Design a protein around this ligand. Structure first.
Ligand code: MMC
Ligand SMILES: [Zn+2]
Length: 258
């Protein structure tokens, strides 16, 4: 029927409706740290989130998205492997039913408790919808979440989750600063990939940060209380909304460090 993360509509079934699922540049992948090539030509990342304008938080049925105003160069990503400016449109997470799983990318087969994705689109294309028709249309910054100490900057998000429990619900969510979700270091791995959920479009340049952020058990716990289902429907907890690692194929992962 329509795609999800269950037994009957899960990742293994996506290819039926979205044949690119078996494409040549699918994401996520396992990052093999000993086979990743250090590239000294890689420039440092430039994250300018000082002028970020968050607007709303939404449960879309597969995750919760925090949305930002992208009508101007307010919160952008540039540098690293990118050419041009990329504006932040939204961020969301992928998590598991247990602490031992939840991330999409893996590092030497290690899975984290969750993974944050800050989605950006290439301003040369004018809008999001056109950027997804290009091979260099999007840039996604991926950050790993491990369970440990609480992340202060994540608390405002955790707290509004009750008001967007079910699919389709949304809440006003202004003045949220995403600078609070970045680790100390900006060292990364980069490779050409795709969106990790349908439509699985191969428009992404992935930037995966080496350093994870810590969140408390209680913070991850509140994520696990969301619902995939709409209000008034039988309850299905939003957990395991992650896609397994795909074959690297004809690709090379580059490292900005050694
Ligand atoms: C090609 Hg997107
Ligand atoms: Zn994602």
């Amino acid at each position: 029927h329509h795609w999800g993360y269950g037994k009957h509509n899960g990742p293994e079934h996506w290819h039926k409706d979205f044949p690119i699922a078996k494409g040549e540049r699918q994401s996520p992948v396992d990052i093999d740290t000993h086979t990743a090539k250090y590239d000294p030509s890689l420039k440092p990342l430039s994250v300018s989130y000082d002028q970020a304008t968050s607007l709303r938080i939404l449960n879309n049925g597969h995750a919760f998205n925090v949305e930002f105003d992208d009508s101007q160069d307010k919160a952008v990503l540039k540098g690293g492997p990118l050419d041009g400016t990329y504006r932040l449109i939204q961020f969301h997470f992928h998590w598991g039913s247990l602490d031992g799983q939840g991330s999409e990318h893996t590092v030497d087969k290690k899975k984290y408790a969750a993974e944050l994705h800050l989605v950006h689109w290439n301003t040369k294309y004018g809008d999001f919808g056109k950027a997804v028709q290009q091979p260099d249309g999007l840039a996604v910054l991926g950050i790993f979440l491990k369970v440990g100490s609480a992340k202060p900057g994540l608390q405002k998000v955790v707290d509004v989750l009750d008001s967007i429990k079910t699919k389709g619900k949304s809440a006003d969510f202004t003045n949220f600063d995403p600078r609070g979700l970045l680790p100390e270091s900006l060292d990364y791995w980069t490779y050409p990939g795709s969106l990790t959920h349908p439509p699985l479009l191969e428009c992404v340049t992935w930037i995966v940060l080496k350093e994870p952020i810590s969140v408390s058990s209680e913070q991850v716990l509140k994520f696990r209380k969301l619902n995939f289902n709409g209000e008034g429907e039988p309850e299905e907890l939003m957990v395991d909304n992650w896609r397994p690692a795909q074959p690297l194929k004809n690709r090379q992962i580059k490292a900005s460090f050694k």
